[PDB]
Structure formats: C-alpha cells, structure tokens
C-alpha cells in the first residue's frame with residue numbers, strides 16, 4: 353500500500369552534486385525511483401537533457417568504458433532494480449525547465465498519440481515500470497527564467513485548455529500503459545507531480561478526473577516559501593502554523609492534502625513531499641509574529657542581488673551564483689550541506705516549530721533564516737501519512753541526502769522508509785525481461801587424430817535496429833545488445849574441456865559447462881546482427897549432437913551485476 357518515492361536528477365553525476373552515481377542510491381529503502389528528467393519537443397519526440405549521462409557515463413563501474421552501450425543512468429537503474437527487487441524504476445517527463453511543450457502536445461490528438469507511442473517504446477527498451485508526468489504547470493503562464501536556468505523552457509504557451517487536455521493525455525497514457533502491460537506481462541503505473549497551492553490547482557488540475565486515472569499523485573509540498581517573498585516562512589511544513597499570514601495560508605502539507613481530498617482525491621493515491629534542501633533569506637527581522645518562533649513570518653530585507661543584479665532578499669546558495677546556472681539567490685543548500693551552511697552563515701540557532709512540525713535555522717542578530725526538512729519532520733510527515741491513510745512520501749532529491757556509515761546517501765531516506773514501513777524488508781517484486789532473438793548452431797567437427805573432439809558453435813544476435821531519433825535509437829541499441837553473455841551448456845556424458853578464440857573461457861558450474869563472454873573485451877557487448885563463431889574442445893570425439901541436451905544464455909549489465917534474461921536457444925529432441 354505505501355510508497356517511498358525518490359527523484360534522481362541526471363545531473364547528480366557531475367561535480368556540482370559531488371559526482372553521485374546511482375550505485376550509491378539506497379535502493380533497498382525505496383519503492384519508486386524517478387529519473388529526472390526526459391524532455392520532449394512540440395512534435396512529441398523524446399529529447400535527452402544530457403545524452404552522456406543517460407546512456408554513456410561509466411558511473412564508477414569497473415570495466416565500463418565511457419560510451420559503451422551498457423553505460424549510462426538508465427542501465428544503472430536496471431541494475432539497481434536487479435540488486436533490489438523491492439524497487440520500481442520510472443521516468444519523469446518535464447519538470448520545471450522542460451514543461452514548455454506539454455501545452456502543444458496535449459492540445460492535438462495526433463501529437464498526443466505520437467508522444468504516448470514514443471514513451472511506451474522508451475519504457476519498453478529501458479524495462480521501466482512507470483511513467484511520471486511532471487507538467488509544471490498546466491494553465492499557468494510562465495516565461496523562462498534564463499538567470500536561474502539557461503535551459504528553462506517556461507510554459508509560455510499555457511492556456512485554459514490545458515486543464516481538460518491534461519486529462520486526455522493522462523487517459524491516453526494510462527490506456528497505452530494498460531495495453532503494453534498486458535503484452536509484456538507486467539504491471540505499469542502512472543503518476544504525476546501536482547502543485548500545492550489552490551490557485552494553480554484551479555487553473556490546471558481537474559482533481560477528481562485526474563485521480564480517477566492515475567495510480568498515484570505526488571504533491572509538490574515543498575518550495576512553498578522562498579526568496580520570491582519578503583516574509584520568512586516554512587517551505588515544506590507539515591502543518592500551517594496558526595500565526596501564518598495570508599500569503600502562506602494553505603501552503604502546508606496538511607492544508608494542501610485537505611484541499612485535494614475536498615475536490616475528490618482518493619486518500620490512498622496522495623503522496624506528500626519532503627525537501628532535502630534549504631531555502632532562505634539573508635536578513636529577517638523578528639516582527640514578533642510568533643514569540644515562540646522568533647523570526648518566523650518576519651520581514652526580510654531586500655539586500656542581496658541575483659546574478660543579473662536583480663535585488664532580492666534571498667540568501668546565498670550552496671553553489672556559486674552563475675547567470676543561467678543557478679543565478680537566483682534563494683538560500684538553497686543541500687541537506688547534506690547543512691554544516692557547510694553553518695560555516696558560511698555563522699550564529700544560526702536551530703528552532704523547532706511544534707505547531708508546524710518543522711525545523712528552521714535563524715540568527716537573530718544578522719537575520720539569516722533557512723527552512724528545511726530534518727529527520728524529525730520527516731518522521732512527523734510519515735506519522736501523518738499513516739494516520740490519514742495516505743499513499744506515501746516523495747523526496748527531492750537523492751543526491752542531496754547525507755551519508756551515514758557508507759558511501760550511500762541515505763540518512764533521510766532511511767528515516768523516511770523506517771517511519772513509513774518499520775525495520776522490515778520492503779516487499780519484493782518479480783522482474784520480467786523480453787527474451788532477445790538469439791539463435792545458434794552446433795556442428796561436430798570430425799577429429800581424425802589426437803585426443804578429444806571439437807564442437808563448432810555459432811551464436812547469432814538477430815536483433816535489428818529500427819528506431820529513429822537520438823533517444824529511442826540509443827535505448828533500443830542498448831536493449832538489443834547482448835551484454836556479458838554467459839552460455840550454459842548441459843551435456844550427457846561429455847566434458848567441454850576448453851574453448852578457443854573468439855570464445856570466452858569455459859568453466860564447469862554444477863551440471864553446466866559455462867562460456868563467459870563477459871571475460872573477453874571483444875565478447876562482452878554483442879551488437880545487433882553480430883555472430884560469434886568458435887570451437888569448443890571435448891574429452892571425446894563426436895559425430896552428432898545427441899550428447900548435447902540444451903544451450904541457454906543469460907546477460908549481465910556489468911561483469912559483477914546480476915544475471916538476467918536466461919533463455920533457451922537450443923534444445924535436443
């Protein structure tokens with residue numbers, strides 16, 4: 353019933369996030385892992401944010417050379433699922449910077465239909481389990497903010513038809529998901545990211561129709577206070593503090609959930625949000641709004657500047673303020689950076705707002721103020737979820753969590769899992785794969801002299817590359833490459849004592865002789881259309897194949913990741 357959902361930005365892997373590779377995600381603590389994000393143009397074609405990150409980076413895996421088709425985050429997500437079958441993996445489309453083309457795509461049925469088709473192919477080739485639509489937001493006119501993000505599309509083509517068209521798009525997605533799930537024998541899910549505030553909901557979100565279609569919906573109950581306002585507040589508070597002024601009324605988890613429910617949202621489908629980062633203001637004066645919470649709801653002075661010189665009350669960020677690359681002063685520090693934050697903003701004292709169940713940091717002399725989630729407030733959100741029969745918690749984002757006793761970033765993720773689920777292992781799911789089109793031939797080679805015999809074996813990858821566009825052709829290529837092939841041969845009364853180039857080495861494992869092509873640089877990625885032809889040595893000469901029972905192959909993403917997709921490619925009759 354419950355979910356623990358996590359966003360992983362593709363830019364986690366670069367220096368700005370400390371080079372955080374998916375193998376250090378605590379996948380056994382999550383039910384759902386969202387790849388953030390895939391883009392798409394006005395014609396419904398998928399578009400990578402960063403091709404290398406998605407399909408090529410080695411991600412710290414020994415024996416992956418940059419660009420090898422088994423590289424990239426999307427393949428690493430498959431490995432996380434194999435190593436942690438509690439996990440479902442999924443793709444988030446859109447986000448704040450890549451929602452610019454939803455309006456046009458949703459308005460036109462033929463384009464909606466092409467977009468859906470492209471998404472279905474994408475999750476087929478990546479073996480993903482769900483689609484997450486992050487249209488942020490329908491009905492909401494927004495211009496790109498190129499100071500914050502040179503790559504921001506905004507939502508400049510927003511209109512009042514978005515609300516209705518969004519439902520059509522979700523209907524088309526869920527129908528296609530239904531159909532492809534039955535074809536592949538798997539269960540797909542559809543989720544969406546939703547806004548916290550009434551005003552955006554009224555413009556873009558037909559609540560009761562939406563919750564009738566989706567499997568669950570993630571409410572973005574964070575970024576609810578920030579440097580865009582000159583009043584300090586909680587950005588991700590569980591409860592509305594009674595002393596909150598008009599701008600922050602309704603802008604808490606509890607109030608947003610109550611609003612969605614009142615509009616027909618089913619409780620079990622509602623997932624609430626936790627922020628793994630701060631927002632904050634440079635100089636907040638205590639107006640005494642709540643003497644029990646000094647500096648909360650106080651007045652922030654407009655004393656700093658954005659990287660385009662716009663005056664702002666926002667505090668400095670963890671990352672340097674660069675025009676087009678985090679250009680707005682927003683007091684944004686990762687949760688794993690709270691000690692860095694305290695070293696830069698000295699004199700911060702830690703306060704707990706027991707009415708909001710939210711922490712904040714405030715220096716009452718300088719005025720500096722930061723709002724965030726900690727272990728305690730995550731536990732309170734989980735308590736609330738359990739008690740209101742809600743659907744779980746979602747976090748933004750994985751790379752900002754702190755480490756504890758290993759290289760995994762897992763302090764808050766482990767707090768969230770354990771408060772939602774207890775200490776027990778998460779439920780595990782079956783993982784299915786589509787068998788590849790692999791054939792083979794086995795021919796005795798007559799030995800007239802010497803000791804032993806020989807079997808000449810051929811294995812052919814008959815896959816064929818079909819797809820167009822960068823995104824679908826790269827993920828198709830990866831899916832249609834046979835990776836680290838192991839050949840399992842069962843015999844009746846005959847030993848395979850050796851193999852010759854270009855085979856990999858032979859070993860005996862239980863009843864099987866095993867040829868390991870992952871151990872051969874030339875053997876470990878077998879491209880669509882390639883044949884491997886090679887000799888096997890036998891302890892006795894043969895004239896037929898009656899002594900061979902069966903030949904199977906399995907794959908691995910990396911030499912040291914789990915075997916998957918074991919399939920029979922030859923059998924004796």
Ligand SMILES: Cn1cnc2c1c(=O)n(CCCn1c(=O)c3c(ncn3C)n(C)c1=O)c(=O)n2C
Pocket residue numbers: 361362363388389401446447448449486488501574575748
């Ligand atoms: C705090 N937060 C909470 N919800 C969020 C965010 C957030 O920052 N972004 C905006 C994130 C933009 N972005 C980047 O900044 C980014 C990037 N690739 C490299 N960078 C450097 N991508 C793919 C991306 O989308 C979101 O889209 N959402 C939903």
Ligand SMILES: Cn1cnc2c1c(=O)n(CCCn1c(=O)c3c(ncn3C)n(C)c1=O)c(=O)n2C
Pocket residue numbers: 448449488489497500504549575576578580
């Ligand atoms: C001026 N203003 C007044 N009230 C506001 C805002 C505002 O900008 N944001 C937005 C804060 C989160 N956020 C962003 O930071 C953001 C964004 N798109 C690009 N950016 C960089 N979106 C879609 C978004 O939601 C709000 O959440 N509220 C309540």
Ligand SMILES: [Co+2]
Pocket residue numbers: 560563564615616617618
């Ligand atoms: Co309803």
